[PDB]
Amino acid sequence: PRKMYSCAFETTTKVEDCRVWAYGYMNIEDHSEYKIGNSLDEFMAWVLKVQADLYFHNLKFAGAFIINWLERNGFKWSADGLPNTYNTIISRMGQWYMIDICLGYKGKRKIHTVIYDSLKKLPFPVKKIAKDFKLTVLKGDIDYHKERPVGYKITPEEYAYIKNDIQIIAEALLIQFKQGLDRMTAGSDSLKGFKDIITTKKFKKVFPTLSLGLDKEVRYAYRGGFTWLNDRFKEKEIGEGMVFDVNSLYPAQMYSRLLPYGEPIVFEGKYVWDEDYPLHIQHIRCEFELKEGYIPTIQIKRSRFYKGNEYLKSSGGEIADLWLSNVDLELMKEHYDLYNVEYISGLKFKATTGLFKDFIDKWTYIKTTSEGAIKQLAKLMLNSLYGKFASNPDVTGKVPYLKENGALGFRLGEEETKDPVYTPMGVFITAWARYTTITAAQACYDRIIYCDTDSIHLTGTEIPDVIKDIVDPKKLGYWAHESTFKRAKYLRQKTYIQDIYMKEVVEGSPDDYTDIKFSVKCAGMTDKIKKEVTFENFKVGFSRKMKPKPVQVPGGVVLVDDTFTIK
DNA sequence: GACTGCTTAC
DNA sequence: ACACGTAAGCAGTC
Ligand SMILES: Nc1nc2c(ncn2[C@H]2C[C@H](O)[C@@H](COP(=O)(O)OP(=O)(O)OP(=O)(O)O)O2)c(=O)[nH]1
Ligand SMILES: [Mg+2]
Ligand SMILES: [Mn+2]
């Protein structure tokens, strides 16, 4: 059995002088076996000898320093596991999962140390993990702005902080390990846990591995959340209003909607109703016009004729070439007049409900009876199961290298593909979610300001009748009354501000409130820049050079300030 | 445009 | 083989 260590670095912040000044490691199963020191050389000597599993919190950061050292001390990158090489799992999106450092083989047994990201299991800051896992946490922080020359000696206080940090993570990881949550990521524990419940034999039967060609066809119909701002309210100062948000929307669809399973049947032309294959994806070419009084529902991506984020009123004289689930197509027919519809071909599926019951019951109970990180973890188990079913087969990743200037660079690796999980489930989970949210928005047409995926933002403070019997703060698939606001302003998708009514005892109301809480929502905008925002300055053209940007420099990674501009 | 390489809102 | 998802976005290179 391989030993497991919780590890951390403390690093300098200068582009011209980027290095580790402190490191710590601690045996997760024996806290007495730990060590803190001021030399990366000393840490990496231990790394190469220990032949164990290491965890850093935010491997993307520490990993840069580790790979900088490896490239300087005779290691090259290799997928083959050759002596004096290292392998990585770094995704196309720049997510770090693994560094596997190989010293060679004794016979057929690999001599290696593997380094994982604890952030993939526990995606919270260390102090938040301590608070919600109820672990010991020291008050205060290391001063990162302090000058620290090579050989700088670690103070007793700094020592205690490093030791605390690695112990918090060690303790939290062990809590999860002893629960059987032992995979390298939350998502991986999620899919495995679901397979444990239904059995692997049943998984294979009910969710067969589709061919890459068929999977690709299915994925044409795979889309995400309905995120939409009503033109009527775009960039206007709004008065009183409210937000409702579905409790676990996608898991609620998984729980109760008609969903596909098994091998699809290919058909040509228009789908013909088949009660045993009641779900389908249809390939069409058509033109369309939005019906008066209906919310637009069609957005077209990867087309030279359309803005991909724009919900379309009209096909505008071009032919829309679409692969659509039956859920989407019926919603399209409800909201649009369709013209010159060419039904080309498609795929039909067997379907049933309840395939995720026990799994959803388990994690919902945990979600409903927990708070903070624990609640958020339960939420992630539910949502990552959906994600795992729609896992892209393309697992091509990034290959690190040391460039001439001594900083790490990356190149796109060789094409790698893995088996599809079950992409039709992904297609229909999101289609039903879109249906749920859009049906509610449409029933609130007179008051609807904005939707993002599973929310409705409404003018006025009275609960609409369409959801009045299904408002609840926790219950699966019910609408939580998220907030009531005194005023708001919506510039564009995922970009809005609200003055929310609050009460001290939490969410408040126009009659009973003690405080007004200014809330900024803006995709891309980081926390310090949000603190700059006011009702007055929140507008297209707003810009602040205060967005931290991680930059590869010689020795590792530093944060430098970049701009964020509302363009 | 494609691409790299980051963010937050779901 | 390991490795949850789309969406909307900003700031760059070539
Ligand atoms: N695959 C995946 N989907 C997510 C994730 N976060 C949100 N989503 C999708 C699925 C969610 O049901 C949906 C709406 O997000 P919310 O933030 O409202 O979470 P949800 O509604 O699940 O729970 P809550 O509203 O917190 O009770 O967006 C994620 O981390 N992974
Ligand atoms: Mg939501
Ligand atoms: Mn929700």
**DSSP notation for A456-483:** EEEESSSPPTTTTTSB-SSSTTSEEEEE
DSSP state of A120: G
The three-point CA angle A316-A321-A326 to 5° equals 110
Q: How far in angstroms lies nucleotide B3's C1' from the CA of residue A437?
A: 35
Indicate where chain A has its CATH 1.10.287.690 domain(s). Answer: 356-391
Indicate where chain A has its CATH 4.10.80.20 domain(s). Answer: 392-421
The one-letter code for the residue type at A375 is: K
Both tokens assigned to A137: 């946490």
Q: Tell me if A87 sits within 8 A of A79, measured CB to CB.
A: yes
Ranges of beta strands (E only) in A422-542 are 448-452, 455-459, 479-492, 495-502, 515-522
Ligand 1: which atom is nearest the Cα of residue A386?
Answer: 1
Ramachandran area for residue A140 (φ above 0: left; ψ -120 to 50: alpha; else beta): left
Indicate where chain A has its CATH 3.30.420.10 domain(s). Answer: 1-184
The count of other CB atoms within 10 Å of the CB of residue A6 is: 26
Ranges of beta strands (E only) in A143-278 are 227-229, 237-238, 241-246, 259-268
Protein-strand B interface by C-beta, 7 A: A 93-94, 225, 304, 398, 409-410, 412, 452-455, 494, 520-527, 549-550, 552
d(CA A143, CA A312) in angstroms, rounded, equals: 52
Domain boundaries A524-567, corresponding CATH code: 4.10.80.30
**Residue whose C-alpha is closest to residue A247's, from A498, A470, A460:** A470
* CATH 4.10.80.20 assigned to A392-421: yes
Q: Tell me if A242 sits within 8 A of A483, measured CB to CB.
A: yes
Q: How far in angstroms lies nucleotide C2's C1' from the CA of residue A543?
A: 41
d(CA A261, CA A423) in angstroms, rounded, equals: 10
Q: Tell me if A137 sits within 8 A of A168, measured CB to CB.
A: yes
Out of A243, A363, A383, A451, mutate this one to test ligand 1's pocket (max ligand atoms within 8 Å of CB): namely A383
Domain boundaries A356-391, corresponding CATH code: 1.10.287.690
Bases along strand C below 7 A from a protein CB: 1-12
The angstrom resolution of this structure is 2.0
Q: How far in angstroms lies nucleotide C8's C1' from the CA of residue A73?
A: 42
The count of other CB atoms within 10 Å of the CB of residue A304 is: 5
3-state helix, strand, coil in chain A (%, to 5): 30, 35, 40
The coordinates were experimentally obtained by X-ray
Helix (H) or strand (E) holding A565: strand A556-565
Instruction: For residue A71, report the phi and psi dihedrals to the nearest 5 degrees.
Output: -65, -25
d(CA A260, CA A390) in angstroms, rounded, equals: 13
Which contacts (CB < 8 Å, 24+ apart) does range A510-514 have?
A: A510/A240, A510/A461, A510/A484, A510/A486
| Assigned fold of A1-184 | Nucleotidyltransferase; domain 5 (3.30.420)
DSSP state of A311: P
* CATH 3.40.50.1820 assigned to A185-257+422-523: no
d(CA A561, CA A553) in angstroms, rounded, equals: 14
* CATH 3.40.50.2300 assigned to A258-355: no
Q: Tell me if A287 sits within 8 A of A339, measured CB to CB.
A: yes
- Cβ burial of A499 (10 Å; 0-12, 13-18, 19+) is middle
For residue A313, what are the contacts with CB-CB under 8 A and spacing of at least 6? Answer: A289, A290, A296
Q: Is A245 touching ligand 1 by the criterion CB < 6 Å?
A: yes
Q: Tell me if A84 sits within 8 A of A105, measured CB to CB.
A: no
